[PDB]
Amino acid sequence: SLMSCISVGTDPMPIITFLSEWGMEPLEDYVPHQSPDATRVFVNGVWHGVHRNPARLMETLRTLRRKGDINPEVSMIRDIREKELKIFTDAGRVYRPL
Amino acid sequence: LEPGHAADQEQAKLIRSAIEHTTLKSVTIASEIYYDPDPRSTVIPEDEEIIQLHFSQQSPWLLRLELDRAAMNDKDLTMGQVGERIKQTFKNDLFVIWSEDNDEKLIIRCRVVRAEEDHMLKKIENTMLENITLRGVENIERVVMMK
Amino acid sequence: SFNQFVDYTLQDIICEDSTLIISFGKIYVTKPMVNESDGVTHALYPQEARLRNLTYSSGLFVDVKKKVFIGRLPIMLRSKNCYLSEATESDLYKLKECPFDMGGYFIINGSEKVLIAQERSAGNIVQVFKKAAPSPISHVAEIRSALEKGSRFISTLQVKLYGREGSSARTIKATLPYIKQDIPIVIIFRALGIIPDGEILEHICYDVNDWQMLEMLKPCVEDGFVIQDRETALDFIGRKEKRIQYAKDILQKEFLPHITQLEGFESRKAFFLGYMINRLLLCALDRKDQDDRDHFGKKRLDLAGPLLAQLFKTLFKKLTKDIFRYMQRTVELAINAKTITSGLKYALATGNWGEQAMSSRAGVSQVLNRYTYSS
Amino acid sequence: TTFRFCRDCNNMLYPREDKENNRLLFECRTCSYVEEAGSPLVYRHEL
Ligand SMILES: [Zn+2]
Fold it and tell me: What's the superkingdom here (chain B)?
């Protein structure tokens, strides 16, 4: 397509820290029932941890890309009906503008 | 169909239901393994009525089965018929009873007959959902009538 | 995608399997040089290397620490490095190189080359599939692990599920790299450290009321009965003293190598394995769909940068292990740069990426369609 | 129908049967811990 471009590839680090400084329970010490509906957190296909109230996390990171602090390319979703958060800093994802 | 009976809208089903391979597995909502040592009373309220009626050695290991009610009229059947079957299937080495097409909950119960039981009953759990027939002949699945 | 290569990537690919019993530090790349017998060296140009069937390449030097030239990089046209990027109308005209041009090509042995975009199943993601009717396995969840920028370890994982719906013993087994058979997920979970079930089930179930899945796991947990500790747990990956190490190793270097191949993270790795066996049973129980493969967001496109990467890598390493060749002769400056350049040329001009060996993808580097601007 | 495991070594539990009292008797096969029926309901299926 005309508008489409390829993802270049960003760094995972200043977003991994940018996240664990917001609610990232390290996958290390998870508590299966204590953290009941734990919306687990991924990155490049990796389980970095878990966070409580997701909606907040989201609206946060959104108007965080919308200023530039995080590369306006790299993308991430919250699968509501699955309580998951996939993060993609990858290189190879086709994308467009909206 | 047959020579004469050609516009026989009922003869149709009369034969649909003589081949349309029905198996136990088609009518079975669930299979539960209960532990009932008393050869004369179920520890279940709903399973009481049918106990004291089939009286009018074994083993304390009970096998209970539910049959979907709609699953008794897309292949028009009867708890009685099925009993007939299972009975003729294992034959003599297991005692079995069944509720009634009446009772709001269609139910079959089955024990054993004469070291490790709840590992044998299981073999004979699949041995029944998949290896036991009701009516119809092998392979024949969906089978429908047309004018 | 080429910018990103030269800028950062080129620095990276010279730092990983670098040093030797001599280190490689910072990196210097030049604007197009053309080096000829009979004359100095010319500030090479598009027009020129085109008409004269040369290579629009340039210089690749690395600070050697005991500064040194090794090969040339076929620079992309209209990039950052290309003399053209900055230029403007009048200059373009004056250079004879066209104004309405858009750029992108390379220029090996003359002609205008282009690289073919490479679609591929986005690495490093969990996926769940059914098998055909006749099959030992009903279901399998897979994950391809591949270090994003190093050794491209494409070691992988089938996480199976024997016994089709009905048959007794819905036993679960999974397959590791360097591993002859398929270990029942019990042994694995125990050699990983997490030893007792009920805890194993905490990694696997996030709701103690899922009597369904719970149920299912049973025959497997019963499979593992015959081993209860993180010693024999690895001993039965022996395929003594030795084998119990062979394993330990294989689990921190060959198992789910993406995430971490480092050390103390058994906690993290096992929890992933957990989420996997979870997903598998999500579908064994028709709760969620068999993963859609033709999902576009689930595929990546290998471009310039990445191609240059695979190549520059499996190429340069062939040099690193030549260094040891000229050195191990030292019973007492021989960095044959011809290989580095004649490689980039080779694969670029032809299309055979995996060196010269026909066992590489012959198709990339289709040579620019110059028929009409649209085309 | 939920089930459980033993204190002590938190491993899975396999049912037994009191031959004299006719009771359900969940037991461990790693140590010795045992216990009684929370319900004669052993295994449910449903399709
Ligand atoms: Zn125990």
Answer: Eukaryota
With tokens 């997701």, the residue in question is: A54
Nearest to C139 by CA among C2, C284, C307: C284
Q: At what angle do helices C211-224 and C266-284 cross, to 10 degrees?
A: 120
Technique used: X-ray
Q: Answer yes or no: do C196 and C334 share one domain.
A: no
Q: Print the domain residue range for C175.
A: 124-292
C-alpha C29 to ligand 1 mean position (Å)? 66
Q: What is the CATH number of the domain that holds C213?
A: 3.90.1110.10
Is residue C252 a contact partner of residue C263, using CB atoms and an 8 Å limit? Answer: yes
Enter the resolution in angstroms: 4.3
CATH numbers and ranges of domains, chain A: 9-90 (3.90.1070.20)
Q: SS3 string of chain C?
A: CHHHHHHHHHHHCCCCCCCCCCEEEEEEECCCEEECCCCCEEECCHHHHHHCCCCCCCEEEEEEECCEEEEECCCCCCCCCCCCCCCCHHHHHHHCCCCCCCCCCECCCCCCECCCCEEEECCCCCEEEECCCCCCECEEEEEECCCCCCCCCCCEEEECCECCCCCCCCCCEEECCCCCCCEEHHHHHHHCCCCCCCCHHHHHCCCCCCHHHHHHHHHHHHHHCCCCCCCHHHHCCCCCCCHHHHHHHHHHHCCCCCCCCCCCCHHHHHHHHHHHHHHHHHHHCCCCCCCCCCCHHHEEEECHHHHHHHHHHHHHHHHHHHHHHHHCCCCCCCCCCHHHHHHHHHHHHCCECCCCCCCCCECCCCCCCCCCCCC
Tell me the two tokens of residue A43: 């990155």
CATH number at residue B28: 3.30.1360.140
The shortest C-alpha distance from B146 to chain C (Å) reads 31
Q: Which of C164, C167, C168 to mutate to test the interface with B (most CBs of B within 10 A)?
A: C168
- For B60, which of D22, D37, D43 is closest by C-beta distance? D22
For residues C197 and C228, membership in a common domain is answered with yes
